[PDB]
A paper describes a structure:
The metabotropic glutamate receptors (mGlus) play critical roles in modulating synaptic transmission and neuronal excitability, and dimerization is mandatory for these receptors to exert their functions. In addition to homodimers, these class C G protein-coupled receptors (GPCRs) were shown to form heterodimers as well. Here we report twelve cryo-electron microscopy (cryo-EM) structures of the mGlu2–mGlu3 and mGlu2–mGlu4 heterodimers in different conformational states, including inactive, intermediate inactive, intermediate active and fully active conformations. The Venus flytrap domains undergo a sequential conformational change, while the transmembrane domains exhibit a substantial rearrangement from an inactive, symmetric dimer with diverse dimerization patterns to an active, asymmetric dimer in a conserved dimerization mode.
Upon binding to the orthosteric antagonist, the two VFTs in the mGlu2–mGlu3 heterodimers adopt a similar open conformation with a common dimer interface formed by the top lobes. Each of the three cryo-EM datasets of mGlu2–mGlu3 in the presence of the antagonist LY341495 yielded two inactive structures with distinct TMD dimerization patterns. Among each pair of the structures, a common TMD dimer interface, which involves the extracellular regions of helices III and IV and the intracellular regions of helices II and IV in the two subunits (termed as dimerization mode I), was observed. Lacking direct contacts between the helices, the TMDs are mainly associated through lipids. In the map of mGlu2–mGlu3 bound to LY341495 only, some densities were observed in the same sites, but did not allow unambiguous modeling of cholesterols due to poor resolution. In a bioluminescence resonance energy transfer (BRET) assay that measures glutamate-induced Gi activation, the crosslinked mutants displayed a notably reduced maximal response (Emax) compared to that of the wild-type heterodimer, indicating that locking the dimer interface in the inactive states impairs receptor activation.
Numbering used by the authors:
A (entry chain 2): 22 to 110, 132 to 659, 675 to 819
B (entry chain 3): 30 to 118, 135 to 665, 682 to 826
The structure:
Amino acid sequence: AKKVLTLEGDLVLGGLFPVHQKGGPAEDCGPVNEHRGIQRLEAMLFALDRINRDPHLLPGVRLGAHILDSCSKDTHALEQALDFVRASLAPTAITGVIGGSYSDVSIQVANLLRLFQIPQISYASTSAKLSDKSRYDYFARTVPPDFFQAKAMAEILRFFNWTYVSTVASEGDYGETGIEAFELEARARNICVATSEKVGRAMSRAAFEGVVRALLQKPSARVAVLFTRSEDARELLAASQRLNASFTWVASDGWGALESVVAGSEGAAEGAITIELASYPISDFASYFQSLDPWNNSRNPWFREFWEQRFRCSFRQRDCAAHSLRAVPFEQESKIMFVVNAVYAMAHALHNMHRALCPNTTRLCDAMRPVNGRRLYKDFVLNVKFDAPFRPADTHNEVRFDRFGDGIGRYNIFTYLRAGSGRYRYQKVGYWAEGLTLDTSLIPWASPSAGPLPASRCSEPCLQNEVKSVQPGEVCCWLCIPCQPYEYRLDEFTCADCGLGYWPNASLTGCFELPQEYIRWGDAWAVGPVTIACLGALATLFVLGVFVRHNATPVVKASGRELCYILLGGVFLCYCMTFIFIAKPSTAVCTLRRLGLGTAFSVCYSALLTKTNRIARSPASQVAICLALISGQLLIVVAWLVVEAPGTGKETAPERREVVTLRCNHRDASMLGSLAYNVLLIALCTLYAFKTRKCPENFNEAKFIGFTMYTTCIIWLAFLPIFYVTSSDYRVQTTTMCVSVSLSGSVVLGCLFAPKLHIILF
Amino acid sequence: RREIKIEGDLVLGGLFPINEKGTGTEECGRINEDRGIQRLEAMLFAIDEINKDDYLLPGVKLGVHILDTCSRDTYALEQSLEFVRASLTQENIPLLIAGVIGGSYSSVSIQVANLLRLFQIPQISYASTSAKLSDKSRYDYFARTVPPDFYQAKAMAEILRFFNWTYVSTVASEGDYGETGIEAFEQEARLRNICIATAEKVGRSNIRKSYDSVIRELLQKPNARVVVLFMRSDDSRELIAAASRANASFTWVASDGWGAQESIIKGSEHVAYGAITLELASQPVRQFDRYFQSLNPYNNHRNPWFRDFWEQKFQCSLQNKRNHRRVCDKHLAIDSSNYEQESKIMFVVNAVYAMAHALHKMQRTLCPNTTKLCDAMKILDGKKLYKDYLLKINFTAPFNPNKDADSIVKFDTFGDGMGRYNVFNFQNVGGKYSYLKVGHWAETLSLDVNSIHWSRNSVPTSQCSDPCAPNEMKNMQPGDVCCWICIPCEPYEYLADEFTCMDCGSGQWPTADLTGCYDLPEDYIRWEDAWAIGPVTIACLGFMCTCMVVTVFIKHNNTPLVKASGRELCYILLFGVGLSYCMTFFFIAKPSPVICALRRLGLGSSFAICYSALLTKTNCFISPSSQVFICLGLILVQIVMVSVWLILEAPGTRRYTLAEKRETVILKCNVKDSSMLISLTYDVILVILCTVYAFKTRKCPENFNEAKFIGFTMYTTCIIWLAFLPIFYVTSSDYRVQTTTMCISVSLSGFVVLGCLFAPKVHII
Ligand SMILES: N[C@](CC1c2ccccc2Oc2ccccc21)(C(=O)O)[C@H]1C[C@@H]1C(=O)O
Ligand SMILES: N[C@](CC1c2ccccc2Oc2ccccc21)(C(=O)O)[C@H]1C[C@@H]1C(=O)O
Ligand SMILES: *[C@@H]1O[C@H](CO)[C@@H](O)[C@H](O)[C@H]1NC(C)=O
Ligand SMILES: *[C@@H]1O[C@H](CO)[C@@H](O)[C@H](O)[C@H]1NC(C)=O
C-alpha cells in the first residue's frame, strides 16, 4: 500500500512530502493533501525539470528523484526512510534528501539519516529544536526557525515602548518554545511579562472566558502577545468578543493574515499586529501546475487520487473528462518558494562539489562515485550564496544557511484595520529581515490622537521628587510614594530618618547639616539683654564710689566693712551672669553659667544670715560664717557638675524648628533643686529676722532689708510657675532668665545700703 | 556473511566482536578468541540454561540472532538494520527481536543505540563503559550491566581522602577514554578537600623522548608523590618504563587499563612498586568452564565462526587443500592448561538473564492464566518492557550462590549496573612481584591496611595542602594555584582570610585565629602606690604645720597693733602655702579627666600668690591698703590668661608612647608638655629677678628679716626651676617625673613659709 516516484539520473535526490493526511487507527493514512503534499511535490518536480534543462547548473549531470510519502506520521516516515540507506549500503544511491514538512517527521528523518551520512534539506520544518548540531549533524532548512519571530515580536514591542505586556501560550509543541524564547529576548530588551498561562485544545468556552478574565486582571496590560495556533487564536477572539474586551493583540505566524481566525470576530480583532512568513508566488510554477492532467502526467502516482478528491468524480465512470485545473481557481502554496529554494540549493552544492573535485570534465567524476555526507554538507551545503531562482525583479533575496544550518529570517508585519467603507483587510506595514522597519503611518492607531495605545508600565517612572522603591508584588511595577520631611531619602531604595532640619542643598546624600538655629541673637533679642547689662554696669560704677567714702561716713563705718564689699560684688555678680546667659551656650559657657547663679544665691543668703547676726547680737565671726556658707554652697556645685557630662548638640522638632543647640547637654534638673534648697534657708533667715523685736534699733536698715527679702521671696515664688508653663521657647526662656536675675540685682541695690549712701551724700 | 539464527518463541539479538578490525581490502580480519568467541559462547551457554530452567520462562523458548560487528562502529550499523526489518509492516524470513544483548565497544554501542531507539528496541550492554551512554536524552532504550567509567573517579578520590592525599597529580591519555574520565575526576576531587596539582595528556603518536618530558615535569614538584593515572594499558606501560630511565619514585593510583595485568610491570617493577590499582570485581563462572572446553568443531554446528577460531588458535587446517598448514589432529581439545576465562564473561551471562527476567515478569502480568505466548505479546512493545520491567529487576547472580548478598543484578535510574570495584596493590613478597587485592569499593570504601606495605606509611603529600600549624596560618602562595603551603603569615597576625592572612589591629594578640581583632589593652599609673603615700603624708604634715601657724598668728595678732598690715600679709602668704600644699593632693592621682586642667590653674594661682606676696614685701595705713589691693588685682590678672591656655583643649587630643607593649599613658590628659613646662618656667623667672634687687638693697627699719627671707627664697626658686624642667623635658615618664616635682613643690612651700614665720616663732617662744 505504498507508492514511490522514482526518476533515473546520475544523481538521485530523495523526497519526503505529506501527500496523505493522518488516517488514525482505522488506516495508516487516508485523505490526500491537496496543498501541503501534492503542490509541494509538483514544485519539487518542476524545480528538478528546470535544473535538468539549465546549461549553467549541472550541464552533464542529470538529477534524479526518489520521492516517498510519509502520510503525515513520524513512524511511517521512519519506515519509508529505510530506502535511501539500503541504496547507500535495484536501489539507486542518493546524494541527499529534500523533504520533511512536519517537525516530528523531520526530526525522525534527521535522526535516522545522520548515522548514514545523508544530508537533509527541509522546506517547511520550523522547529526550534532542529537547530542544535549535537543531535542533527546533516540537517538544513530554508525556512527560518520559530524563535526568530519571538525576537521580532520583542523588537516590535520595544519599538512602541510596550514594556508591560501579557503573553498567552499554547499547550502543544508550538506554543511553548516560542514563549520561552520571547521571555528570554524580552529580559534582554527591558520588556516585562505580566501574566503567563497555557491554553489547551480540549479547553471549552469556560476556560477561554476564565483566561480572558485573568488577562483583564491587569488594567495596565493593554497589549496581549499571542503565540498559539489558528484554532486557539480564533477561540480566544470569539471569547473576547462575547465578553466584549478590548486588547492590542500581537501574534506570531499562527495567526498571520488568515481570515478564518477573524471569521465572525472582526470587532475585537481590530488593531492586532500579526507577523507572517514572507514569500512570493511563482508564475512559472503556477503555469506548470495549471497545465496538468492525469492523461499527460504519469510520473506522479498520487495524481489520480488528487484529481478524484479535488474534482469530485471517479475514473470507473467517465465523469473526470471536462474538469480541468485551468478553469478552476488555483491558490499557490506559500511554501512553494522554500521547496524550490531547497532543491536549487542542493543542486548548487552538488555542482560546486563536482567542479571542485575535477574541473577537467563536466560529466560525473571518477572520484565522485562514492558520495559522503560529511564533506559535501560541511563544504558546500553550508556555503551557498546563490541568487534565488524565479525571483521577481525589484528585490534582493539570497539563499544562505547560517552556522546552525537554518534559513534567513524574513517576516512581514501585518495589521487588522477597518477601511472607510467598513471592509476588514490585512495590509503589510513593515518587515523584519535582521532589522525592524515600520512606516508608522498606515497603522489605524498610529495616527496623531490621544495616545497610540500606550502600554508603558504598571506605573509611570517617578524620580523627580518621590522615592520609587515601593512595589506591590511585581518587580516590574514601578511606583512612587512621597516620604515625610522628617524622612529625607539618601538612597534610591529607602528614605533615611536623619531629620528634616538637616536638609541637603539639592544633594540628597549624607543629610548635610543646617547651621541655622537659635544659637545667639546678635540684634533680634540682644537689645533687651544690653539694657540689663548697662544697668548692672552703672550700678557697679555707683558701688565703686559708694564705698570710697564709706570709711568717712559714720553710718557705713559702724556697719561691717568686709561684708559691705561683698554686697557690692554680689550685686555686681548678678549682672555678671546676665551676659553669660545671653551669650551662646557651649560645653564651657553653660557650665560657667550654671555656676553663675549657684553663687548668686549664696551671697544673698549669706547677707541675710549676717544681717540676722547683728540683730540677734564680731567681724571675724561674721566673715567666717559667710565664707563657710560660700564654701559650702560651692562644695556641692563642683560635685554636681561632674555627675553629668556636658556636651554640645541638641535635637529638636523637624522642618527647621530653629531650636538646635539651644542649650548644652548638661542637665539643668539638679540646678533647680540646688537653688531651691538655699532659697528656703534664705527665706527662713528673713522670717527669723522679722521675729526679733529689735525694731527700735537700726529701724531704717531693718525695714529696707525686710522689704528687699520679701520682694525677692515673692518674685522667686512667681518664677517657678512660669518655667513649667512654657516648657519650650528657649529664646523666650533665655529672655525671661535675664530679666529675672536683673530684677534680683535691681532690688539688691535698693537694699539697706542705698539709704546709707543717700544720708552720707546729703 | 555468517550469523546465528536459532529459532524460538522469543528471539534476542546479539552483537559481538568475533573478528578484529582490519585495514585495506579486508574490512575485518583476525578472529578475536577472547572478546569475540568466549563472550559469544557465554550468551549461548546462558540461554541454554534459561531454556532448561523450569522457573524462568517455562513455556517460552528463547531464540538468538547474533551478528559479528567486526570491531567497527560503521560496520555494526549495517547489520543493525537486520534487527529492525521484522518491525516493519521469502528467501529469509525476518525474526522479531525482543531485545539486543550486544555492544563490547563504546563506539559500537553508541552507534547501535542511536538506531535502536528509533524503533523502540531495548538494548543491554555487557562491556560498554562509556560515560556518554548514561545520557538518557540521546540513549533512552540503552542499559548496561557494567558500571560506567566515571565511577572509577569516585573510587580513586575516596582512596586519596582515606590516605589524606590532597596534593595530587593527574595524567590522562588522548582519545575518548582519558579526557572523559579525567574530566569527571576533578569535580569529584573538588567535591572533597582536594585540588589538582598538574594536568597532563599522553598521546599514542609520540616518541619516548616526549615520555621523558612527561616524567620530568612531574619531578619539578617535590611535594606531589602520588600520581592519579587514568591512562590506557599500552600508554601506562611506556610511562612507567620512562620513570625507570629517569630514576623516579612515585605512588601510582590507576584506574581500569592498569589493574592486575602482568604486561605493564614488565622490565620496570622497581618504580611500579607500591602502586594502587583498580579492577572490575568479576568472579569466575564455574559452570562455563566445562561448557567451553567440551566444544568441538565436529559437534558445535550452531557457531559458524568456530571453524575459524579453531584454525586460528591451533594454527592448523581441518581440510588442508595444498595449504602451508598442518592437518588438525582428531584428538585436539582445549583444557585448563591453555584456557583462561575472559574477565567480563559473568557480565554477558548477567545481561542475558536480565532480559529473560524482564520478559518473564512482563509475561506473567500480561498472561496470568497461561504460561505460553499470548496475542498481547505479538506487538511486544519495547517502551513498556524497558521503562517498566527491565529497569525494575532485582535478582541474584544465577551462577554465584556464595555471595548472593552483594551480587544482586539491578539497574539504577540511568540504566547502569552497580559499581563494585576491586582495589589491588603491587607489592614484593620477596623474590617475586605480584598483585594482591587489598580492598573493594561497593558503594562504600573498605581497605585492608595491614596487608598494604610501602603504603602503610602515610607518605604525606600535604607539604602544600595543609601543614598549617595553628599559628594563624594562611592558605596562599605566589606562583602556585593551590599549593598554599601555609608559610605566608605569622602567629602575631590574626587569621581573617585565606589568600591574605589579613592582620586585624596593629600589635594585637589573636585569641585562637580570628577573635583577637580588638586593640591590645593598656595599663595606666597605679593609684595609692608606695611612692605616693610618702608625699601624701608629707603634704598632710606640711598642711597641718601651716594650719598651726595660722592659729598662732591670729592669736598673737592682738598685742602687736603696730603691724596693722602684717596680718593681711600673713593671711595671703598662708593661703598661698596652703594652696601649694593642697596641689600635691590631686596632682599625684592617676585618674585626671579634668583634674590636670585645674592643676595648671592651681599651680599658676599658687605661684602668682607667692609672687604677689614677695613683690609687696619688697616694695614695702591707706598706702599699704592700696598695695594689697593692687597685689590682689595682679594675682587675678595673672589668672586671666591661665584659663585662656585651657580655652582650646583642656583634656588634650591623644597620648602615645614609643613602646607598644606597656603603653603606660594617662589616656585622659593630653596637654602639651612643652607648653606646660614653658609656662611654669616663665612664672618663676620674674620672681627671681624681682627678689634679687631687694636682696641688694638694705632694709634697716625692722625689715631686714623680710629682706633676708626674700633673698633666701630666691635661690630656692632658681634651683627648683633648673631641676624640674630637665627631667621632664626628655624622659617624660608616666610617674617618675610627676613625683619629683611634687617633692620639689612641697619643699619650696615649706621653705618660704619657714622664713616668714621664723620671726613670730621666736617671739611666741
Ligand atoms: N513549519 C511548521 C511549524 C509548526 C506549526 C506552525 C503553526 C502552528 C502550529 C505548528 O505546530 C508546530 C509545532 C512545533 C514546531 C513547528 C510547528 C513545522 O512543522 O515545523 C509546520 C507549518 C509547517 C507544515 O506542517 O507545513
Ligand atoms: N569497556 C570498554 C572501556 C574502553 C577502554 C578501556 C580501557 C582503556 C581504553 C578504553 O577506551 C574507551 C573509551 C571510552 C569508553 C570506554 C573505553 C568500552 O569499550 O566501553 C572496553 C573494555 C571493553 C571491551 O572492549 O570489552
Ligand atoms: C518610544 O520611546 C522613544 C524614546 O525612548 C521615542 O523616541 C519613540 O517615539 C517612542 N515610540 C512611540 C511613541 O511610538
Ligand atoms: C587521615 O587524617 C585523619 C584526620 O585528619 C586521621 O584520622 C586518619 O587516620 C588519617 N588517615 C591516614 C593517616 O591514613
